[PDB]
């Protein structure tokens with residue numbers, strides 16, 4: 001299986017995040033106010049999303065990174081962010097650690113490629 005560690009925190013500790021792979025929710029966690037590692041494994045290899053799902057007054061999520069099969073993918077390096085509040089809207093910008101609105105940061109497919117190397 002593929003190992004995925006999500007490192008994230010909630011602003012008030014009520015926040016729920018789901019790890020989704022190829023559209024399938026493989027695990028859900030309630031966050032604490034401290035950056036913490038959360039780990040799951042899956043045979044699925046689709047697009048990895050870290051999704052904030054229970055936005056309410058006072059709730060926001062900050063994602064540091066994920067680790068996929070030993071490889072760190074920084075949240076701020078991800079061009080897809082559908083939750084950050086920027087330019088007066090949800091998902092206003094890529095390359096953010098933040099999910100303010102319900103939405104997700106996409107970290108790409110489990111298996112990536114470069115010059116015929118698969119990682």
Ligand SMILES: [Ca+2]
Nearest residue numbers: 111117118119
């Ligand atoms: Ca490989």
